[PDB]
Amino acid sequence: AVRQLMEAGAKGFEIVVSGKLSTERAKFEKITYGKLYKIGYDAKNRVRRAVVHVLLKPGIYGIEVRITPATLRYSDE
C-alpha cells in the first residue's frame, strides 16, 4: 500500500495509523515522502486529507492520509 502510490507520480504523501496496533499502548506509526507541504495555503485547503477510523478488535485505529497528485503544482517556481 505504498508502492500503490508509487504507481502514481505523487510528489508527496503521509500515512498515519494511530491506535493500539500491537499492545495496549497506542504507538502512532507513520510513513512520509518528499515534496509535501505541511502548512500554509496548500495544507488544509489544496492538499488532500481524509481521516477515517476503523473498529478492530479493541478498535478505533484512526487513519490519517495526506496525498498530492503529480499535477498539483503549488505556488513555487
Partner RNA sequence: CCCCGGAGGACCACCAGUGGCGAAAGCGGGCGGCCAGAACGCGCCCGACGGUGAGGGGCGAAAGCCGGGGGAGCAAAGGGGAUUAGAUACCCCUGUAGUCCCGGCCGUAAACGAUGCGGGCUAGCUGUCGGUCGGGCUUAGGGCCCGGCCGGUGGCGAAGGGAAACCGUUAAGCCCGCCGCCUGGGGAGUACGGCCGCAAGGCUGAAACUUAAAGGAAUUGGCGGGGGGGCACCACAAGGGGUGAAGCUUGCGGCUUAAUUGGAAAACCUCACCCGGGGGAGGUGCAUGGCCGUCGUCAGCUCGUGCCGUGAGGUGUCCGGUUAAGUCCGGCAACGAGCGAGACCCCCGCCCCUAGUUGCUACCCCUCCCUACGGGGAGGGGGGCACACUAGGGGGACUGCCGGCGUAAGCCGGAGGAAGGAGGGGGCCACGGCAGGUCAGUAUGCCCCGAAACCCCGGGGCUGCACGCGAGCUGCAAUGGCGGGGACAGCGGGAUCCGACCCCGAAAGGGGGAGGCAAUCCCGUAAACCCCGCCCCAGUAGGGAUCGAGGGCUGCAACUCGCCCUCGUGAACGUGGAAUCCCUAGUAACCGCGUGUCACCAACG
Q: Grid coordinates 500554509 are at which residue?
A: 40
Which among 17-25, 31-39, 49-57, 69-77 is the span making contact with another protein, rule CB under 8 A?
Answer: 69-77
Q: What is the DSSP string of 4-23?
A: HHHHTT-SEEEEEEES-SSS
> Please, what is the minimum distance in Å from the beta carbon of residue 76 to another protein?
7
Cross-strand pairs, 30: 16
Q: How many residues does the chain have?
A: 77
Q: Which residues of the chain form contacts with RNA (CB under 7 A)?
A: 16, 18-20, 24-26, 28, 30, 34-44, 51, 53, 55, 57-64, 74-76
Q: Which residues of the chain form contacts with another protein (CB under 8 A)?
A: 75-77
